[PDB]
Structure 1
Amino acid sequence: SMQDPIADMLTRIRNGQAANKAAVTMPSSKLKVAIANVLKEEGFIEDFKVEGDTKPELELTLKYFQGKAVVESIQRVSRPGLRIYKRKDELPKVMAGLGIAVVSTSKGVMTDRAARQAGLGGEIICYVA
């Protein structure tokens, strides 16, 4: 059964990018929307939108730069079988700072750099590069 919607969303992005899809759609959730907001404001996806009243669907517009997918790698880190939390001193750098780690802090879901600037740790959702 489906037991990690976030890994599912990351996999949908990864597979759609590999397949050169212009967009991917998945069932929505507020956590997925927060992650997509981080992805969009960091430049990894073009845009996202949610449609539907009782069964919301989240659609992500993927982006490509020069025939290449922009999301080079996208990887789940904390997962249901093994949760990963980091204090602010031990927040991971992704690709020596050229990528991002998406962190759920008590002030919301943000990049590792934003969490570092806010002086917070949290759950390491995924690495995007």
Structure 2
Amino acid sequence: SMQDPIADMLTRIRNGQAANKAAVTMPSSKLKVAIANVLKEEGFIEDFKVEGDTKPELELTLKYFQGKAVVESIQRVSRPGLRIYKRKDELPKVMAGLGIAVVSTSKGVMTDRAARQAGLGGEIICYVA
């Protein structure tokens, strides 16, 4: 990317959700390992392998259950220059809470249940559905 590494990643993934390729790959900062170690665990994709040490870079495995593809409607919201630092008792539940809401907390990125369990919100990263 030039001027957001995480926004321009989220174009790269769901273009794989429009031709149903197997593996996708983007140049991977240490933040970017902490991105898809949430999407795997909540079940939206399957497996990933970092590789490279002068170009640290990922091998994400997609997940399309049918002709239907699992990662339906992912959206970045906090785009740079429009930071929305949510207080935690405003929190965006995604699609009546049926999805997950990736929030950049202190204690990590892994965020469904920061509403009650962790107990501190922050900058939204992206809605996920």
Normalised by the length of structure 2, the TM-score is 0.94
Distance change >3 Å, CA 86–CA 48, structure 1 → 2: same
The 3-state SS of whatever aligns with 1:49 is strand
Higher strand share: 1
Q: Secondary structure at the match of 1:50?
A: strand
* Distance apart, 1:66 and its partner CA: 2.1
Deviations 1:80-121 (A, max 9, x none): 121121111111000111111101111111213245321111
Question: Is the deviation greater in 110-119 or in 15-24?
Answer: 110-119
CA distances 1:13-42 after superposition (whole Å, capped 9, x unpaired):
111111111111000011111110010001
What does the per-residue CA deviation read over 1:50-103, in whole Å, with 9 as the maximum and x for residues that have no partner? 000111111211101122111001111111121121111111000111111101
For the Cα contact (< 8 Å) 1:92–1:112, is it kept in 2? no
Q: Is the 8 A contact 2:89 2:115 kept in 1?
A: no
User: With structure 1 as the length reference, what TM-score do the two structures score?
Assistant: 0.94
The size of the alignment, in residue pairs, is 129
Moved more, 96-105 or 107-116: 107-116
Distance 1:75 1:102, change over 3 A: same
RMSD: 1.3
Instruction: Give unpaired runs (5+ residues) of structure 2.
Output: none
The whole-number CA distance in structure 1 between the counterparts of 2:4 and 2:92 is: 22
Match for residue 15 of structure 1? 15
Cα contact 2:114–2:121 (8 A) shared by 1: no
Gaps of 5+ in 1: none
Cα distance in 2 for partners of 1:57, 1:115 equals 32
Distance in 2, matches of 1:9 and 1:59, equals 13
CA contact (8 A) 1:103 1:115 kept: no
Return the alpha-carbon distance in structure 1 between the equivalents of residues 112 and 92 of structure 2: 7
Q: Tell me if the contact between 1:91 and 1:116 (Cα under 8 Å) persists in the aligned partners.
A: no
